[PDB]
Amino acid sequence: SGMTQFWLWVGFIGMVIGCIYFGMKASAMRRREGMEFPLESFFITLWAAALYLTMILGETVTPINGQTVFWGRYIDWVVTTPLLLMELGVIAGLRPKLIAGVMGADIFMIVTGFIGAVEAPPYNYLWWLISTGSFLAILGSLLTEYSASAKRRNGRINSLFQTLRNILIVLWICYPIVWILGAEGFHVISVGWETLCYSVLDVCAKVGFGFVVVSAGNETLAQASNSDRIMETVHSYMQS
Amino acid sequence: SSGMTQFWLWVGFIGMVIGCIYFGMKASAMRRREGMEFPLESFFITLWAAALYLTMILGETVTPINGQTVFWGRYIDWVVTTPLLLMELGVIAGLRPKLIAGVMGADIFMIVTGFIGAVEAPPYNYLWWLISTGSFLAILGSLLTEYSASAKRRNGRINSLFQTLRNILIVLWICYPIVWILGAEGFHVISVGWETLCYSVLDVCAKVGFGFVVVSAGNETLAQASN
Amino acid sequence: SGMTQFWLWVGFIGMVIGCIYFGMKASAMRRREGMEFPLESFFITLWAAALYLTMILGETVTPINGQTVFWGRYIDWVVTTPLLLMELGVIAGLRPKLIAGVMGADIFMIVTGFIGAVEAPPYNYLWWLISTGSFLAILGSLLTEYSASAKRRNGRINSLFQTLRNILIVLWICYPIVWILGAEGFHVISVGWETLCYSVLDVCAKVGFGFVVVSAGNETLAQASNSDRIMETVHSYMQSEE
Ligand SMILES: *C/C=C(C)/C=C/C=C(C)/C=C/C1=C(C)CCCC1(C)C
Ligand SMILES: *C/C=C(C)/C=C/C=C(C)/C=C/C1=C(C)CCCC1(C)C
Ligand SMILES: *C/C=C(C)/C=C/C=C(C)/C=C/C1=C(C)CCCC1(C)C
Ligand SMILES: CCCCCCCCCCCCCC
Ligand SMILES: CCCCCCCCCCCCCC
Ligand SMILES: CCCCCCCCCCCCCC
Ligand SMILES: CCCCCCCCCCCCCC
Ligand SMILES: CCCCCCCCCC
Ligand SMILES: CCCCCCCCCC
Ligand SMILES: CCCCCCCC
Ligand SMILES: CCCCCCCC
Ligand SMILES: CCCCCCCC
Ligand SMILES: CCCCCCCC
Ligand SMILES: CCCCCC
Ligand SMILES: CCCCCC
Ligand SMILES: CCCCCC
Numbered sequence: 001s002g003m004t005q006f007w008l009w010v011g012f013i014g015m016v017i018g019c020i021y022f023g024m025k026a027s028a029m030r031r032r033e034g035m036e037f038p039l040e041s042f043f044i045t046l047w048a049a050a051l052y053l054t055m056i057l058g059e060t061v062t063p064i065n066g067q068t069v070f071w072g073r074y075i076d077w078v079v080t081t082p083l084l085l086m087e088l089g090v091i092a093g094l095r096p097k098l099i100a101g102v103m104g105a106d107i108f109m110i111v112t113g114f115i116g117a118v119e120a121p122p123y124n125y126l127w128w129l130i131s132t133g134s135f136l137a138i139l140g141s142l143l144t145e146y147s148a149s150a151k152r153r154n155g156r157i158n159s160l161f162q163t164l165r166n167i168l169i170v171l172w173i174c175y176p177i178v179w180i181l182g183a184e185g186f187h188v189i190s191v192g193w194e195t196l197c198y199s200v201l202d203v204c205a206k207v208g209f210g211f212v213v214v215s216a217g218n219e220t221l222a223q224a225s226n227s228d229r230i231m232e233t234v235h236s237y238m239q240s
Numbered sequence: 241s242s243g244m245t246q247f248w249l250w251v252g253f254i255g256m257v258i259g260c261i262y263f264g265m266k267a268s269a270m271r272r273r274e275g276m277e278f279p280l281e282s283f284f285i286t287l288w289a290a291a292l293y294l295t296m297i298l299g300e301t302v303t304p305i306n307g308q309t310v311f312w313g314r315y316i317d318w319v320v321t322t323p324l325l326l327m328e329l330g331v332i333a334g335l336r337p338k339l340i341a342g343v344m345g346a347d348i349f350m351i352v353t354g355f356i357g358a359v360e361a362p363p364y365n366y367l368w369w370l371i372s373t374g375s376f377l378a379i380l381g382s383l384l385t386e387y388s389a390s391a392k393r394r395n396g397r398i399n400s401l402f403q404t405l406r407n408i409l410i411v412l413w414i415c416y417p418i419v420w421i422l423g424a425e426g427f428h429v430i431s432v433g434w435e436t437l438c439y440s441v442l443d444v445c446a447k448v449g450f451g452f453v454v455v456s457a458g459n460e461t462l463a464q465a466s467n
Numbered sequence: 468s469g470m471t472q473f474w475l476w477v478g479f480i481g482m483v484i485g486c487i488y489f490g491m492k493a494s495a496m497r498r499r500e501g502m503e504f505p506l507e508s509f510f511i512t513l514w515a516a517a518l519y520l521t522m523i524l525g526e527t528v529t530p531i532n533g534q535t536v537f538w539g540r541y542i543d544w545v546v547t548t549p550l551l552l553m554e555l556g557v558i559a560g561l562r563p564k565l566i567a568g569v570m571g572a573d574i575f576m577i578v579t580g581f582i583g584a585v586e587a588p589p590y591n592y593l594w595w596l597i598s599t600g601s602f603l604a605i606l607g608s609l610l611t612e613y614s615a616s617a618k619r620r621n622g623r624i625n626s627l628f629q630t631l632r633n634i635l636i637v638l639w640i641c642y643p644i645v646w647i648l649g650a651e652g653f654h655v656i657s658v659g660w661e662t663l664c665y666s667v668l669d670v671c672a673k674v675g676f677g678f679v680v681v682s683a684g685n686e687t688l689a690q691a692s693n694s695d696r697i698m699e700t701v702h703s704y705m706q707s708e709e
Contacts, residue, residue, distance in 0.1 A: 030612060031612075031704065031707075032705070043575075050578075050597070
């Protein structure tokens, strides 16, 4: 009731703070290399801040079949989570075609998760399993193609990737658990407590995640986005 | 959905599920190799088609809109799979990337305008069918001109692979307006159950059958197609 | 209204005429380079023509909370307006990553404007201010990185960009003013005159804007789309932070 709107505000204020920070740093290096990382970090927080305002105002919260569905989360995630995987893919030096495949799996994961959030007690679990299935394929890529590519970059880029990869995996693994423990699955935790965990995860997965990216230095991010080094990484990754 | 409709929604589902395992196995086996995009594109095409077919089995994307029951999950399926099919065919033909995007934009326009007719009145569903068919002819033109005029300029065994897939695509895609205009969206001359039979047979042919011929071309061939 | 239906037809006819013109010039520039410009201009007018037809038939005009919302405009704008900024981005020689940022902010502008169009009198203004904020940042980029990159390019191309930029700026400024003075905000102007303004703005911003693009020489258009002349304006722009 009141706990839901309070923690919806905590998420919205957390997103806005990241917007000011990422937006300032992104426009401070508009002519530089590595600009795409604070730029992507800014749009991820911007899209999340808007959608969090849609839920605060109740614009994207709707009862479908007896359950109050916060469907604005899926409008958020279907855009922000592919951008996060793309941002991590550029740092890892992964081939863009494999990045597009991982982003495609992410869209499938979010869309099927939305179907489960709108489904009945029998079928909300079925779509949860299918979405989790694509989630494991994403986790497999983050530990295989992502890690094998980044290992072939300089030590500081591979160091930044592994930190961001571990941050991503630890945070994202909690999302389906919050989903299944909330109103979409087993109504064992309250909606307010579910709103609490989602906002804490969202701020960590977007603002805290983006902070680690921009805190790597202008030289690091410029090297991670450099075309010569990326094509060098993709080539070396393919010869094994 | 009725008994025949539900039966043929399952045939399309199983067809896409089978294609997923084949294309998915081949895709992750060519991960560090060239030509990987073709088994991967074929996998995502069958994967997105499989999920949408499941939504229609469960009636999640089956709804009455203006009296009629509209299977709007098909247009969620088509607006994604058909642009990917033309893009995969555009890379095999060695087409310029800017005109691949243009052909894909014309394809999205075709699916969207076709969806408007699916939910419209018998006066205006035929009007949008003609608009949708108009862009379909422009795509058939590009398939017979720019697609063929760029595959000629490439390796002789790639050009043969293109002409096979393209002629498969053209003959298959031509029946879709026929079923639509003869189905519930146009003149209801065939039943919804019989209409779903045609869509299931066509979808499995144009996705798993089409995708099979692509991956059945050899690894050194698909590597040359992606360079 | 009778006036809205009339001016919905004017916009629809204006978009169709633009389709015939740009489609003819596109199919006459097949294996030439610079083909993307009349083809981009053609798709912009085609998407707008189809969406204007959906509004004529009332398919995309619906009472949402009881206010008549022409939500087909936002289905149109969320597609055509990012293409216009992208097409202008290629002419200006702007780096593609910054083009994507402007395009993303443009989609943000249309989406938040659609939310305001369907919301109550308290919060329709709040989303109007949010959308106008991203509009100001886009105008900032048009005067900043767009102009700084086209300045270092050919004299014929920089002249074309500035003409298109001034045309875009002047036309796009009127949209939030029509919006806030129309049914979406304070209902100061009627639905009929609001339909007039949107039709007049849309035709000029798509048919007239694209006309200036295609009415440039095939020399200028081929040079504006060149891969390595776009790599050189990017290399010079990215290294001249002086
Ligand atoms: C910033 C928001 C983020 C990073 C959201 C991430 C969300 C997920 C990783 C959601 C995953 C889901 C599953 C794995 C299956 C069931 C439903 C979802 C959507 C909770
Ligand atoms: C795998 C699914 C495929 C390949 C579907 C293809 C569908 C079409 C080519 C549909 C075309 C239509 C028209 C040309 C006009 C009227 C309506 C449609 C959607 C049947
Ligand atoms: C061809 C159609 C065009 C160029 C439409 C342009 C529309 C805009 C620049 C709209 C801007 C808006 C704001 C700046 C804030 C409030 C709402 C909008 C959508 C009117
Ligand atoms: C490139 C590797 C990640 C993309 C592949 C997408 C696979 C999605 C897995 C679907 C699993 C379905 C569970 C039944
Ligand atoms: C009435 C619902 C029952 C559906 C049964 C479907 C059986 C599928 C037959 C085998 C399909 C094989 C496709 C290649
Ligand atoms: C496929 C290459 C681009 C061709 C342009 C596609 C647009 C066709 C629209 C036709 C509409 C016809 C209405 C009667
Ligand atoms: C490279 C293009 C710049 C993109 C920045 C987008 C800015 C959005 C501003 C939103 C402000 C919200 C109003 C308070
Ligand atoms: C019975 C629940 C209805 C499910 C709607 C599914 C929407 C899928 C959007 C692609
Ligand atoms: C009253 C209008 C009938 C509904 C038509 C819906 C068309 C949607 C086009 C996207
Ligand atoms: C630069 C701060 C942007 C804040 C966005 C507010 C929610 C759309
Ligand atoms: C080895 C680094 C792990 C980082 C995970 C932190 C998530 C809060
Ligand atoms: C009704 C109180 C729910 C408490 C849930 C706590 C989950 C960590
Ligand atoms: C760069 C040429 C692309 C024109 C078509 C735009 C995609 C809808
Ligand atoms: C590869 C498994 C397909 C599942 C369809 C929902
Ligand atoms: C190049 C990344 C910017 C994308 C914004 C949607
Ligand atoms: C009801 C307004 C929400 C729109 C989300 C795109």
